[PDB]
């Protein structure tokens, strides 16, 4: 790895600089190098990892959706044949996206998840595993598409089971997991009723636990509760 010669602390320092500069590809490369040092990640370092790759793959997904829409329009009735270029370029972006997802899933599998014993780290990594299988599912069309969807579901479900046992209902990681698993149900698994039920039950159980929280924890939890509410409003 090109980061093998850099100190772990220097990689973390530069990941933070890259975030300040909005250089998310650099940020992800630095955090990949930090993970490959083999030591477990702190809470803050897990956030740096997640932010970096979320921004990289988010840009790729946005581009893929633009190109897929152009491609679909080109194959509708009355469109003029434009050649293979749209499909080729959509495939190029799709392959790069899949490459990033495979890289993240590889970091989780070698060996972040197996060494994560605390609820806060294990649920965080399993949520990430569900997320990046979800991104693979968004572009999947072949023989393994159902297996990709089930890999996302399985990771989310293990994370949910741990989070319900080991975390309070206002924990922001538990909330963000439920938010994303709900989106998985709605957008990937064709289960809008499950998506809505999960978002509503998550919101209501967090609401009833807010009274236990400090002002700063309250702000963190209500932020993600509002995202649950936004989705419910979009879906109902």
């Amino acid at each position: 790895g090109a980061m093998g010669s850099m100190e772990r602390a220097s990689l973390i320092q530069k990941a933070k600089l890259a975030e300040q500069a909005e250089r998310y590809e650099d940020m992800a490369a630095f955090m990949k190098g930090a993970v490959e040092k083999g030591e477990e990640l702190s809470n803050e370092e897990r956030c740096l990892l997640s932010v970096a790759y979320k921004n990289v793959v988010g840009g790729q997904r946005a581009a893929w959706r633009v190109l897929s829409s152009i491609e679909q329009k080109s194959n509708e009735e009355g469109s003029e044949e434009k050649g293979p270029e749209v499909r080729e370029y959509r495939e190029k972006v799709e392959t790069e996206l899949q490459g990033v997802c495979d890289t993240v899933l590889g970091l989780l599998d070698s060996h972040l998840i197996k060494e994560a014993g605390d609820a806060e780290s294990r649920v965080f990594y399993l949520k990430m595993k569900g997320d990046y299988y979800r991104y693979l599912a968004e572009v999947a069309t072949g023989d393994d598409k159902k297996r990709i969807i089930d890999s996302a579901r399985s990771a989310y479900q293990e994370a949910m089971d741990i989070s319900k046992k080991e975390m309070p209902p206002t924990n922001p990681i538990r909330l963000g997991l439920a938010l994303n698993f709900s989106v998985f149900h709605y957008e990937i698994a064709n289960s809008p009723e499950e998506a809505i039920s999960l978002a509503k039950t998550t919101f209501d159980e967090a609401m009833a636990d807010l009274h236990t929280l400090s002002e700063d924890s309250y702000k963190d939890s209500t932020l993600i509760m509002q995202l649950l509410r936004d989705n419910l409003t979009l879906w109902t």
Partner: peptide, 5 residues
Amino acid sequence: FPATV
């Protein structure tokens, strides 16, 4: 698109 974090 719906919100995810």
